[PDB]
Swiss-Prot record, chains A, B:
Name this polypeptide is given: Glucose-6-phosphate 1-dehydrogenase
Phenotype when changing R46A: Decreases catalytic efficiency toward glucose 6-phosphate
Gene3D superfamilies, per database record: Dihydrodipicolinate Reductase, domain 2, NAD(P)-binding Rossmann-like Domain
Family that this chain belongs to: Belongs to the glucose-6-phosphate dehydrogenase family.
Residue sites binding NADP(+) per the record: G12, G13, T14, G15, D16, L17, A18, K19, R46, D85, V86, K148
Alphabetized Pfam families for the sequence: G6PD_C, G6PD_N
Activity's dependence on pH: Optimum pH is 5.4-8.9.
Length: 485, 485
């Protein structure tokens, strides 16, 4: 395995995410041998810790992932720490020093990765200071890993992008996308492009509609402070659903390189129809979860910290239209919500039914290619076969496949994947600015209608797949949801 | 369920097949309610039995399939018997009488089905006498069910057909085909025509080659008397494999009616290339099973009743070429043999590998659509997906489906199916003369080369999938057998 020479700095190095996910992930890259000698990890935050105390912090962090004591300690030796205030410009000179000493001690020439595991409000400020205070490398690469969320509207995101471009280019920006870094999501291009029979049918001539579902069983729990301002539209649709749709709607790329993949995705994003008030009312649905069955499933307005006068959407369902010749007339239905029937992230490609008449009671029905992303990876294909009857008749059978236990064990952690791809300079599993800006332009149109109360707010029984308005949406084009719960 | 009014006569009514398969099958049609009041079954053979004794013969026969005693007896009451010599013309007048009395007793107007469960040498003689001695109905239908085999060469079969056409038309002839009456074989048209994604790819643009395997684990057992004269070529290839190929190679029919289906099959059969001596040597392989491992698996020449100077083929493998635009350049590999690795009847459609380059170690491989007919019905689809590795790479996964226990229980017996279709006048699951004559013309070309010893005879270890010459055959076009045992 080839060695990766890099210097990673962790802003918010003492944070919960750093201990719980970040450090164990880079430890895995060490266990696999990607990180060997020529690497260093500088941690930073406000706390007044010295190197030994930080090393101890990393030690406790990777303790539940350690088999070999000597291997753990050899890794820990690559860490250092420097107390620093991100809002204090002068303070960056102290971090600059810790970085250069790390590069000298381990002989790293440039190749810097900056991780901002801090509050979103510091994101652009750090970026601008990395440039002005000269913490950027003059050799190799300079890559920035930005945590969620990337703005709360197109304006804020545009302002953020503007600040980041002061030190980096868009292709140096790696925005943490939890759903893009999923194994099954990465299987879509393989099934499509790797198999001529699907690749040739991935268009309007064979597909009736594409469905994307991100249902959850849980409610708002304690996250009401955040959720009441964001809702299903911002919390799930904007970032997680839009990017999955990006992999489904993309054109066929020139090659499988990140540049070509992004170009192919933007081809679809640039053809995405942005809606006005009338269309938002015609094509989208916003809902709030009402009473369930037992007293444990209380409505949204009775949840902890919910203002009672909240018109927050805990469910969203809508139709996306792309003005690309290959998707002309093919609706892309999306939906996501809290307190639904089952926890599941899936894509269902509904193929047009065949027009060959068998002369049977049951004629050929619509074939479906399902790709279950969460909780366990699975691929299913409901096809038309012959029924076991006396007279010739059709029926639909399901050919399926599920990930094996060996598959699950060999699957890299979401954060391991993301850190690794950044070190590689592979942006194929990351969204670019075009994809993110269009996603915001689309969602902003919808949000404008909602805050203005220019669209109805539906309700649904907790435990169902949403309100009937969601089914009304598909029935309008003669379609229906494949996953009924 | 609608009632079928018919009069079935059984030549060889006292035979083993009649007791063991025939009677229990028609009893099922009674249990399901297809046969109600207006039907009669006249049994005939040389034995001097009266009606009561024959009724007793049918009683013992259906005893292991009886739940309701009253239902069994009500069925048995529809039977009668008449001793008769098929080689005695005058004797047919006595059978004629038993038939007319049966039609009167149960009020059946015409609709006669004649079953010849006798030695093949009487087949044409009975047919000619049915006409001359006036046992044919003047109202309704007159259908003849012929048992295997339909000739031993094109000549004998052509002579047989000529005799049968003296009383019936080809569409009134129902030739017992054990493999055509199988559930999975009948699923091929459904998967293809019922699913646009397969229907559109069922041609030279997407298919690399089609493979048909009819492997058996057993040897010649006791059947050496018959097998030494027939071999794998006549015993399995001519009748069973050719017809399965007929369902695979057929064009897309105008409708799913027997006439259109036969026309679509003949479109392929008429384009089947008949081979000369050179081609038989280039495209086919004949083999005889040699020693296995343990002393129980002795070679063919050491089997009971085998003449030791036998050049009989217990294995055959060959390539079939169709001069149809849709199959231009697509080889149809077939193989069947005794003493092979596993008992299995399957079709494997090998799709051309995709030309999209991922830039991975493993590029897109060939997708396969497998249809396992025996022992248990199953459909598999090996597709290209993403491997569980750190770097993007492809792998092939298998999406599968197997028949359920409810499926197996609801599946009609092969003979029930055939009798039922004849009563319906449905020839779609039966071969016509064109299909049978071409099959013979093809096989005769090969047999001419073998008896003349103008082609080598290979050998193979009992337990393998055949001789290396079989693999040499596919390697010549860059293909290989999917089923390795
Ligand atoms: O994400 P999470 O929820 O897991 O993290 P968290 O524990 O809630 O805190 C966020 C992280 O950011 C750091 N941080 C906050 N303000 C900072 C500042 N002004 N300068 C430098 N580091 C700062 C914190 O370290 P400190 O709280 O020690 O600054 C902490 O490691
Ligand atoms: O087939 P399988 O092996 O199961 O049958 P099988 O028991 O070997 O005998 C063939 C059947 O054909 C009948 N049969 C033979 N010669 C006949 C003739 N000349 N006229 C009328 N019926 C005749 C036999 O009845 P008989 O032997 O009683 O004629 C018997 O029912």
């Amino acid at each position: 395995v080839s060695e990766i020479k890099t210097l990673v700095t962790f802003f918010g190095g003492t944070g919960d995410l750093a201990k719980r996910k970040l450090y164990p992930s880079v430890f895995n890259l060490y266990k696999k041998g990607y990180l060997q000698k020529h690497f260093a990890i500088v941690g930073t935050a406000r706390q007044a810790l010295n190197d030994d105390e930080f090393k101890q912090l990393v030690r406790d962090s990777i303790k539940d992932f350690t088999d070999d004591q000597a291997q753990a300690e050899a890794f820990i030796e690559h860490f250092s720490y420097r107390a620093h205030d991100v809002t204090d410009a002068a303070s960056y000179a102290v971090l600059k020093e810790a970085i250069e000493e790390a590069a000298d001690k381990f002989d790293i020439d440039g190749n810097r990765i900056f991780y901002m595991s801090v509050a979103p409000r510091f994101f652009g400020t750090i970026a601008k200071y990395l440039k002005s205070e000269g913490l950027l490398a003059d050799t190799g690469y300079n890559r920035l890993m930005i945590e969620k969320p990337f703005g709360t509207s197109y304006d804020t995101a545009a302002e953020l992008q503007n600040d980041l471009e002061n030190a980096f280019d868009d292709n140096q920006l790696f925005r943490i996308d939890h759903y893009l870094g999923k194994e099954m999501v990465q299987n879509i291009a393989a099934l499509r492009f790797g198999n001529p029979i699907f690749d040739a049918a991935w268009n309007k001539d064979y597909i009736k509609n594409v469905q994307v579902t991100l249902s959850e069983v849980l409610g708002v729990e304690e996250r009401a402070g955040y959720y009441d301002t964001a809702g299903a539209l911002l919390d799930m649709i904007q970032n997680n659903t839009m990017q999955i749709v990006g992999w489904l709607a993309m054109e066929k790329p020139e090659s499988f390189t990140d540049k070509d993949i992004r170009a192919a995705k933007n081809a679809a994003f640039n053809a995405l129809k942005i809606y006005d008030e009338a269309e938002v009312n015609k094509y989208f649905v916003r809902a709030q979860y009402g009473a369930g069955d037992s007293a444990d499933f209380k409505p949204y307005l009775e949840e902890l910290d919910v203002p009672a006068d909240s018109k927050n959407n805990t469910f969203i369902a809508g139709e996306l239209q792309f003005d690309l010749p290959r998707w002309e007339g093919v609706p892309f239905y999306v939906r996501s919500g809290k307190r639904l029937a089952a926890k599941q992230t899936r894509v269902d490609i509904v193929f047009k039914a065949g027009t060959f008449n068998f002369g049977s009671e049951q004629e050929a029905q619509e074939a479906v290619l399902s790709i279950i992303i969460d909780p366990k990876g699975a691929i299913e294909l409901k096809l038309n076969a012959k029924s076991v009857e006396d007279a010739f008749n059709t029926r639909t059978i399901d050919l399926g496949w599920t990930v094996s236990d060996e598959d699950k064990k060999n699957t890299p952690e979401p954060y391991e994947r993301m850190i690794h791809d950044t070190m590689n300079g592979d942006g194929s599993n990351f969204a670019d600015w075009n994809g993110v800006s269009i996603a915001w332009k689309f969602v902003d149109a919808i949000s404008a209608v909602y805050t203005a109360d220019k669209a109805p707010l539906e309700t649904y029984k907790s435990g169902s797949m949403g309100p009937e308005a969601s089914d009304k949406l598909l029935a309008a084009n003669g379609d229906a949801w494949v996953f009924k719960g």
